[PDB]
Design a protein around this ligand. Structure first.
Ligand code: HIG
Length: 251
């Protein structure tokens, strides 16, 4: 029944609110003037101003900020995954596998919520770092954030809300195509139910947006590429800057 799928949509929406302290709605209210206005970092000079509001050099301090935020996201996505009906019933190794790979794709989906064509919200929405400033960082650093902005600009064109994102990120975690997956079928049965709920949710929430379901699934291609490029750049920094490496979770 469709009434059963509506209950799954509400349950995923509630768990998303409980797990993610910074929603798209909060982020959009900050970015549009509705919630307090953020301090804008567009300069190396303006960066020093935001430090007393509220690692050696600028590009390195920003990089460790990204790594710190990545860990928090891993923690919050892990907490959310436990609530997906069927997730915790799966084999211990599979749970770990679905998270190990699925986490990178969720991070970039949810990071789009904090972005517009000209910048990104930082420090729990208190700040706003411009696209131009991030791009101007000394190489190889001033390269990593640019494709996330590229995906965000196009991903935000879908005009999704938090209730759509809750179901969409559930689909990501439950993908039966991960390396080292022992029992593929139980994962696919969960995903089938999730996709059914996502389909209904998009038809009810965006009734005028023709083929948004087909449009949303195609975006999974864009995610996989940004992950590859991120891992590729992560190796460069690991060899050039033999300093601070990945956090236990980040490893
Ligand atoms: C919400 C911010 C965020 N979450 C990220 C996740 C999940 C993944 C990746 C790859 N990057 C992430 N970022 C980037 C965007 C630009 C920026 C600036 C900073 C930053 C720069 C200078 C000073 C402070 C901060 C800061 N600290 N805490 N939040 N922002 C830290 C992080 C980041």
């Amino acid at each position: 029944e469709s009434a059963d799928l509506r209950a799954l949509a509400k349950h995923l929406y509630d768990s998303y609110i409980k797990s993610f302290p910074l929603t798209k709605a909060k982020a959009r209210a900050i970015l549009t003037g509705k919630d307090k206005s953020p301090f804008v970092i567009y300069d190396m000079n303006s960066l020093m101003m935001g430090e007393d509001k509220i690692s050696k050099e600028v590009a390195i301090r920003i990089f460790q900020g990204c790594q710190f935020r990545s860990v928090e996201a891993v923690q919050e996505i892990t907490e959310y995954a436990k609530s997906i009906p069927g997730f915790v019933n799966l084999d211990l190794n599979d749970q770990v596998t679905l998270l190990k790979y699925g986490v990178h794709e969720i991070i970039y989906t949810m990071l789009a919520s904090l972005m517009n064509k000209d910048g990104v919200l930082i420090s729990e929405g208190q700040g706003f770092m411009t696209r131009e400033f991030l791009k101007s960082l000394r190489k190889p650093f001033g390269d990593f954030m640019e494709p996330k902005f590229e995906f965000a600009v196009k991903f935000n064109a879908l005009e999704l809300d938090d209730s759509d994102l809750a179901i969409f990120i559930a689909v990501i975690i439950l993908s039966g195509d991960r390396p080292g997956l022992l029992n593929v079928k139980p994962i696919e049965d969960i995903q089938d139910n999730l996709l059914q709920a996502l389909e209904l949710q998009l038809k009810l929430n965006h009734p005028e947006s023709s083929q948004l379901f087909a449009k949303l699934l195609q975006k999974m291609t864009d995610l996989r590429q940004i992950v590859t490029e991120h891992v590729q750049l992560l190796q460069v920094i690991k060899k050039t800057e033999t300093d601070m490496s990945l956090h236990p979770l980040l490893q």
